[PDB]
Amino acid sequence: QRTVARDITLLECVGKGRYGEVWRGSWQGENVAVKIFSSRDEKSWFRETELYNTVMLRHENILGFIASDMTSRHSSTQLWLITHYHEMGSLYDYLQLTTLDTVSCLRIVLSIASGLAHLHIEIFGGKPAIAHRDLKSKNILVKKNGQCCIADLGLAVMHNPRVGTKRYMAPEVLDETIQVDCFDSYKRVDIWAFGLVLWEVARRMVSNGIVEDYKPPFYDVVPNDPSFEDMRKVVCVDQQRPNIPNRWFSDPTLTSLAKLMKECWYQNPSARLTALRIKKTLTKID
Amino acid sequence: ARDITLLECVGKGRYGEVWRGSWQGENVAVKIFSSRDEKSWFRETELYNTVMLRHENILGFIASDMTSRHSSTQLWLITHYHEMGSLYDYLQLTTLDTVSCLRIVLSIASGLAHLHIEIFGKPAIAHRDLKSKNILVKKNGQCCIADLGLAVMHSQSTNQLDVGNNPRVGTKRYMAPEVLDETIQVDCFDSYKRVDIWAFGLVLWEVARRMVSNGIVEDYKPPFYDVVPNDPSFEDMRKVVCVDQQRPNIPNRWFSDPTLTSLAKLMKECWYQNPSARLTALRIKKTLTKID
Ligand SMILES: COc1cc(-c2cncc(-c3ccc(C4CCN(C)CC4)cc3)c2C)cc(OC)c1OC
Ligand SMILES: COc1cc(-c2cncc(-c3ccc(C4CCN(C)CC4)cc3)c2C)cc(OC)c1OC
Ligand SMILES: COc1cc(-c2cncc(-c3ccc(C4CCN(C)CC4)cc3)c2C)cc(OC)c1OC
Ligand SMILES: COc1cc(-c2cncc(-c3ccc(C4CCN(C)CC4)cc3)c2C)cc(OC)c1OC
């Protein structure tokens, strides 16, 4: 009976961090992405694996699962997550060099909204509702067809000493008022972070020969690797929001996207738009 | 060298399938879980993450995998392969002398005490499905405990109890009275250790029946063979254990043999209806270390 070919050739390291490493790998002639977890971040492997063991997500705007592997070593456990490989890399990577036109900007943001609404929605029969809890431009990959997909469900909750990336934390997370037993609270945290990503992308959309340089959200008001307190003072105490440049108000697409961002950034989480309402609004732009 | 050849199916049931396979020139066991038992696969994976679980009397772990394309998911556990099979298989076809009987039961006590005792690491672990089909026989005549899919973990360091999320229940024939009457104290780690001790007592009985004394041995029988239907229901077991207060009978021939007299005493102290009266795994290991 059958050969189970499990060998993956690790070809190129495409990410190194506290989480561990991501490699471009080869399996049976095909590219795969291999995330090798640090000891420090084993709980992210467990949570993503538990989720995929609960529901095998399959969606064009969700990074495609291939496998979770645990391998015993002499004195340690090796944990790999294997997924589809997107050679263009992360949206963060892509926006550094590339500028966008109206069609590519909308395609990027509507594909993200699509992936996020798919996470958020409970389907009966189906999938539980899922909140991501660490949405940001480094956790979004660019596909060759110009749509994106959402990655990293290591913090996801279904209806870990890891917490979300501080720069993208909603005000209720920073002021510890989040209603932690209400699933909808976690959806509203993702909408906040989505609005920051929408801002990051919109800056790189050209209008009337103008574009902004790539900057991360709050680049002008917090340090690199901002503290929790740094973020709380900006977002909660002073209630700052990312700048909308004047030049956007000459462009109908960027004018509509500015309005959309605003409705992701209400202090009151329950006032924020839903991912489904963001999709509809994006489908009516242009 | 990661690839695996599946050579022979050694078992198919509700648990899924187990294959004898070849890996880096060695026999390995490859369990493919039924899609209905996915919570067991995940729990066994959480347990085998613990480097200090490793023990001569615990089934040795190689790898765990979840694989998927489209809507199809496979769940794999890859372990050491024990070609002598389970203790259940072994006892069908062989009788034991004193030395072999004690080697087998002390090895199982050794495994179980290793599970139950926290290492300050490895959490304290209660198995919850101990039975002769979940014990493998090794060529050195010791055994190893398998199938951690129902395990409960506790750390007294942090006062944390992890009962997991598995709808699966233990094998009905081996369920303790408090499991069968559903009065078990579910937020008490000691409750689950006591359930393991009950099932250990039943395994001791199965083994001891196969040890020869004075030219006599009993035929292999599973616990409660005489008092329940074939393929007993939960309620069948509850009737005999809880309502009828039945315990496996001690053959009178055991009482002329010192070893079987000692083992009968040990079984009885695993079988109290009061869970708190039952011996600990460490006490059983110590008692079996002193018996000959
Ligand atoms: C264990 O580990 C890894 C395995 C694999 C892999 C390699 N070839 C074939 C397979 C395969 C898929 C599915 C079936 C089905 C066939 C139909 N039947 C009714 C149910 C079972 C059999 C075999 C797999 C899953 C890849 C891996 O990584 C790329 C693995 O490591 C993570
Ligand atoms: C966020 O999360 C995960 C992401 C990925 C992932 C999937 N496709 C492609 C990539 C990638 C490829 C290539 C570049 C660069 C490298 C330099 N030069 C060649 C330009 C391009 C960057 C990024 C990644 C990092 C996999 C993951 O797990 C397996 C992730 O974790 C869930
Ligand atoms: C993990 O990932 C990959 C796996 C595979 C792969 C390898 N062998 C066998 C299979 C397979 C065959 C048949 C069934 C089904 C068919 C219908 N019914 C009868 C139930 C059983 C399932 C699975 C697969 C899917 C290939 C892949 O890529 C080409 C994979 O992706 C990288
Ligand atoms: C219980 O649990 C697990 C067990 C195993 C495992 C490991 N070595 C050997 C075996 C075995 C081999 C052969 C027979 C023979 C005996 C009699 N003959 C007439 C038919 C068949 C029985 C048993 C098994 C079943 C692997 C597992 O995971 C990979 C298990 O799950 C944790």
Swiss-Prot record, chain A:
GO CC terms of this entry: activin receptor complex; apical part of cell; BMP receptor complex; plasma membrane
Domain of life: Eukaryota
Binding residue positions for ATP: V14, G15, K16, G17, R18, Y19, G20, E21, V22, K35
Cellular localisation: Membrane
Side of membrane Cytoplasmic, spans: 1-286
Disulfide pattern: none
Job of this protein: Bone morphogenetic protein (BMP) type I receptor that is involved in a wide variety of biological processes, including bone, heart, cartilage, nervous, and reproductive system development and regulation. As a type I receptor, forms heterotetrameric receptor complexes with the type II receptors AMHR2, ACVR2A or ACVR2B. Upon binding of ligands such as BMP7 or GDF2/BMP9 to the heteromeric complexes, type II receptors transphosphorylate ACVR1 intracellular domain. In turn, ACVR1 kinase domain is activated and subsequently phosphorylates SMAD1/5/8 proteins that transduce the signal.
Entry protein name: Activin receptor type-1
Gene name for this UniProt entry: ACVR1
Full protein: residues contained: 201 to 499 of 509
